């Protein structure tokens, strides 16, 4: 069972840096783009980041564009989230996720995590 | 590929008529799988690919009046048997059934084949076999007829190759 | 310089079981291991002592009825791998392709009889020895005989002991040679309690210490 | 006890003759005579995994194509081929076949009485090919069989007449 | 004296492919080294992963055009390395001279369309399960399938996974087995805007876990 | 995984027969049929490096002069001469071109559609020769170059008849 694993998460002041961490087990983690959801409170989750496995990518939303880092393991089978320049919208829960599908949707994917929470200070 | 693990449940069913004008060498077969109605025969229809084993309990109703002895056996690779290998059925996995003595029997297989998956709607390994060894002796005292059972479920079902629907 | 040597004469031909192996033609080929196979069989001789087979009674069944007649003697049958009774046994399948052997063979009996009904046996075995068996069911307890009664077990084993001259015995017993050719069993009936079609149902295997030596292939081909 | 003669190991270690002989071969191991020893201690298991070689007397060159290859390439030189000597051909040849162990009883069919055509060990091709025998090397079994011995019509046993020094 | 040898009968001859060497003739020659050269390949699958090549639409183009028609199946095409859309490919190429295959192969999928059209489309792999490729865009959800859209790159890959009963595939599809032989892919268009003659480009390659088995040659010569 | 059966090393390492065969021959391995296996692997590279090896079968005695050498040189003795036996002569040759690697096309001439002439081996002399066999020892391969497989005409793909054990 392609099982998800989050950990990372925590609370931090604004413009810091976090990194949040994906532990993925099971026989398909080469084949299944992996990527990040954030799902603020009272909200929906959203597409934040997604990171490819053949050539290695990358596609960032446009909220956070220019300030995040997705990046991949696949002999650990881990997938980590380097977060900077902080700001109070970011605080929510993230999901990490997977499946063959690159979509900004996120019923669409199968496979999801538990979660870890996100806290930013101002 | 994924386990499944509804798909591994008891289904109760019947093998045959055993009454007292058959001698020994009397031969009733049921190949496995056979036509499972629950989530099973939608895997065997929707999936391709499947691999698991067997188990089954056969039971025969009567009392210890009736004098006789019935053999039950798993053979893989099933064929035709001529008279002369009738005498060596103990070769593959069996129990005895007798009034007298016992009344449930108990067999446990597992996968095995050529290919690592098999297509069930194609080719069938396992086989239940049940065989009259002596013959129903009866008397006024004692049941004219008894009825056996089989229950029998997959054990490790394991499917590879997901296949879409027919609608 | 360069070794000499000598060519023998004789040596070099083809012989259909020599221990010589064959230059390759093809290599690097790696085939997916068979491992974790159940169901993996090294010895013939472990297969035939495991799992016994029937014994083919007259007019081609595999159990004596008991019979309401004078005669005691319920029957009897030739000890022998090239028997009329072991003719459908897995045993003697494998023994047709050898010439000698040396060993126990075991017997089985088990009672398909009616609970209600009781009843009294022995078996006996005879050696090559006296011109006649000893049909007479007190006459065969001066031989290495045996008594089981059907009220502590419905299955009762009896062990054929091995007794010849020599060390090893033909399998394929021969056109000369007659009279009893090593040994028979004769199975008696004490008594009986509304034991009119009450069954017995006799299987044979290998036993312990059984042991086949030469191959031969002896059919018509 | 010594119980070294009925190994199953060594007692498939002896060239056997295959009857059916042609221009063009497909080597099977179930063409061999089903009542000689190899033959018949065959039959007796259902499962079967083994290497092979094989000796040929053959006019002209001799050709192997491996299993999968198609049936033009027997007329291409590129493929392994072996150049006449006098007596005969020795050669060994591997296991090519896809499937992890062969069979000798198939129970169904595997295209969408007769074992798919996959259950072989390749083929071979020359002008002609007057004998050819085969030895299985490091042969293993699965699944033992019924084995029957020769019928007795009505003598309580077989007599078969041994060698013997009489003058 | 001297050693006693037997000259062995069926050995000697000379096989095409034997791995002995022959006796040199002009001894004492240095050549000049090769060393530092750009571009050596020791291994001809490693050159098939790391370079993919385009396929051959219908028609001898290399990508495929968007449809305005109901039928909002783009195309299918067979997965099989002697299928006709495969016919101008390195893999296929290499894959022409043996026997047998296993393992994954990669879909690339480029997007040339103009950057003022979206879309969203899936694909989705049918092994050789139901008679009928799913033609419908939403039945093939059973499949194992993605989605992908052109609004956060460009450029999506896919992979192809191995399913099969033994454990290795014939690559030589065989005149016999008709029948959708193991694979198909085809693409759905959930949505176009703009997109009439707007391109998309897909190339194949060999997966991370690829192999070919059994070197033969079966071209006609 | 295992890929051995795809080394360049390994691939090129078999007897392939050479078609054009004159009593005077200049052994160049661009002679090779372009569609076997060797030839079509082989035009698959720009350039290459490799030793050699081949099998003649000759009336008379067999000379070898090396690249460079006068066409006038195969007359004598001097040269390496190889006196014949039965079935055919076996020998090894080494690579003495002056490049450092050879070249399968060339852009232009070389003289102040046709490689230049000093891309070869060698040369052999007999009072006739009637096959001849090359095979490359240690290859190695640079550059490589589009590798084309039979075209498909209208069907979906290639039909090529398999071996089968069918009887």
């Known amino acids: 069972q392609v099982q998800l694993q989050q950990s990372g998460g925590g609370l931090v002041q604004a413009g810091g840096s976090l990194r949040l961490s994906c532990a993925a087990s099971?026989?398909?983690?080469?084949?299944?783009?992996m990527g990040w959801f954030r799902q603020a409170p009272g909200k929906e989750r959203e597409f934040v980041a997604a990171?490819?496995?053949?050539?290695?990518?990358?596609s960032y939303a446009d909220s956070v564009k220019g300030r995040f880092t997705i990046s991949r393991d696949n002999a650990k089978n881990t997938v980590d989230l380097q977060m900077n320049s902080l700001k109070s919208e970011d605080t929510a829960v993230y999901y990490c996720?997977?499946?063959?599908?690159?979509?900004?949707?996120?019923?669409?994917?199968?496979?999801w995590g538990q979660g870890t929470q996100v806290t930013v200070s101002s | 590929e994924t386990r499944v693990t509804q798909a591994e449940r008891f289904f109760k069913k019947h093998l045959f008529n055993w009454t007292t004008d058959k001698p020994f060498g009397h031969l009733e077969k049921l190949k496995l799988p056979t036509d499972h109605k629950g989530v099973y025969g939608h895997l065997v229809d929707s999936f391709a690919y499947m691999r698991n084993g067997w188990d089954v309990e056969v039971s025969a109703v009567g009392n210890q009046f009736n004098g006789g002895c019935l053999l039950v056996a798993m053979v893989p690779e099933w064929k035709k048997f001529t008279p002369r290998e009738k005498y060596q059925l103990t070769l593959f996995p069996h129990q005895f059934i007798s009034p007298r003595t016992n009344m449930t029997a108990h067999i446990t297989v597992p996968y095995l084949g050529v290919n690592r998956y098999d297509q069930y709607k194609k080719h069938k390994p396992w086989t239940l076999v049940v065989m009259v060894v002596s013959p129903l002796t009866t008397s006024s005292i004692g049941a004219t007829e008894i009825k056996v059972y089989a229950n029998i479920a997959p054990t490790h079902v394991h499917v590879a190759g997901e296949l879409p629907s027919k609608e | 310089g360069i070794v000499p040597v000598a060519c023998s004469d004789g040596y070099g031909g083809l012989v259909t079981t020599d221990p010589k192996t064959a230059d390759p033609v093809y290599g690097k080929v790696y085939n997916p291991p068979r491992t974790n196979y159940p169901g993996r069989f090294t010895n013939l001789l472990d297969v035939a002592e495991a799992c016994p087979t029937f014994l083919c009674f007259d007019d081609g069944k595999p159990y004596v009825v008991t019979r309401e007649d004078e005669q005691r003697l319920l029957a009897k049958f030739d000890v022998s791998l090239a028997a009329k009774h072991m003719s459908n046994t897995y045993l003697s399948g494998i023994a047709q392709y050898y010439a000698q052997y040396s060993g126990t063979i075991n017997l089985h009996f088990m009672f398909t009889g009616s609970t209600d009904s009781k009843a009294r046996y022995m078996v006996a075995y005879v050696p090559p020895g006296v011109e006649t068996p000893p049909d007479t069911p007190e006459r065969a307890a001066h031989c290495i005989h045996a008594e089981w009664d059907t009220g502590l077990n419905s299955k009762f084993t009896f062990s054929i002991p091995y007794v010849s001259a020599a060390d090893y015995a033909y399998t394929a017993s021969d056109v000369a040679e007659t009279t009893n050719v090593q040994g028979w069993v004769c199975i008696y009936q004490i008594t009986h309690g509304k034991a009119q079609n009450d069954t017995l149902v006799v299987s044979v295997s290998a036993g312990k210490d059984f042991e086949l030596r030469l191959p031969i292939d002896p059919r018509t081909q | 006890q010594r119980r070294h003669h009925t190994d199953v190991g060594f007692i498939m270690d002896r060239f056997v003759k295959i009857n059916n002989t042609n221009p063009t071969h497909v080597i099977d191991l179930m063409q061999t005579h089903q009542h000689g020893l190899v033959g018949a201690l065959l039959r007796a298991a259902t499962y079967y995994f083994s290497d092979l070689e094989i000796v040929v007397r053959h006019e002209g060159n001799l050709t192997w194509v491996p299993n999968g290859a198609p049936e033009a390439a027997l007329s291409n030189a590129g493929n392994p081929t072996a150049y006449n000597k006098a007596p005969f051909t020795r050669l060994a040849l591997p296991y090519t076949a896809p499937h992890r162990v062969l069979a000798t009883v198939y129970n169904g069919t595997s295209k969408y009485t007769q074992l798919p055509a996959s259950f072989n060990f390749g083929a071979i091709r020359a002008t002609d090919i007057s004998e050819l025998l085969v030895r299985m090397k490091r042969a293993e079994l699965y699944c033992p069989r019924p084995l029957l011995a020769v019928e007795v019509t009505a003598q309580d046993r077989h007599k078969q007449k041994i060698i013997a020094p009489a003058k | 004296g001297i050693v006693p040898v037997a000259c062995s009968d069926g050995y000697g001859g000379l096989v095409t492919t034997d791995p002995k060497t022959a006796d040199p003739v002009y001894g004492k020659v240095y050549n000049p080294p090769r060393t530092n050269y750009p571009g050596r390949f020791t291994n001809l699958l490693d050159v098939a992963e790391a370079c993919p090549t385009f396929l051959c639409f219908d028609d001898g183009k290399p990508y495929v055009v968007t449809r305005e028609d109901e039928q909002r199946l783009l195309a299918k095409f067979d997965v099989s390395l002697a299928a006709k859309h495969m016919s101008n490919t390195y893999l296929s190429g290499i894959a022409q001279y043996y026997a047998q295959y296993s393992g994954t192969i990669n879909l690339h999928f480029m997007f040339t369309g103009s950057t003022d059209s979206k879309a969203r489309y899936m694909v989705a792999y049918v092994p050789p399960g139901v008679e009928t490729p799913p033609d419908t865009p939403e039945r093939a959800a059973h499949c194992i399938h993605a989605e992908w859209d052109t609004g956060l790159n460009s450029k999506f890959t896919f992979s192809i996974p191995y399913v099969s009963a033994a454990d290795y595939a014939y690559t030589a599809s065989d005149v016999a087995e008709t029948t959708n032989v193991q694979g198909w892919v085809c693409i759905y268009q959930i949505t176009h805007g703009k997109a009439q003659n707007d391109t998309l480009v897909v190339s194949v390659s060999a997966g991370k876990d690829f192999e070919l088995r059994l070197p033969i040659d079966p071209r006609t010569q | 995984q295992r890929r051995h059966h795809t080394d360049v090393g390994f691939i090129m390492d078999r007897f392939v027969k050479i078609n054009n065969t004159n009593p005077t021959h200049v052994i160049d391995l661009m002679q090779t049929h372009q569609h076997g296996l060797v030839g079509a692997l082989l035009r698959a590279a720009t350039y290459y490096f490799s030793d050699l090896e081949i099998v003649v079968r000759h009336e008379g005695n067999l000379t070898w002069v090396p690249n460079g050498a006068p066409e006038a040189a195969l007359s004598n003795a001097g040269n390496p001469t190889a006196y014949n036996k039965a079935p055919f002569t076996r020998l090894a040759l080494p690579y003495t071109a002056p490049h450092r690697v050879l070249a399968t096309v060339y852009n232009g001439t070389s003289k102040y559609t046709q490689l230049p002439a000093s891309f070869n081996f060698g040369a052999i002399r007999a009072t006739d020769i009637s096959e001849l066999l090359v095979r490359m020892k240690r290859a190695e391969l640079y550059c490589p170059r589009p590798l084309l497989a039979v075209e498909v005409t209208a069907q979906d793909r290639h039909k090529q008849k398999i071996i089968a054990p069918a009887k």
């Open positions: 099971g026989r398909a983690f080469g084949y299944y783009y």
């Open positions: 990171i490819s496995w053949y050539d290695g990518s990358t």
């Open positions: 996720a997977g499946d063959r599908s690159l979509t900004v949707v996120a019923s669409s994917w199968r496979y």
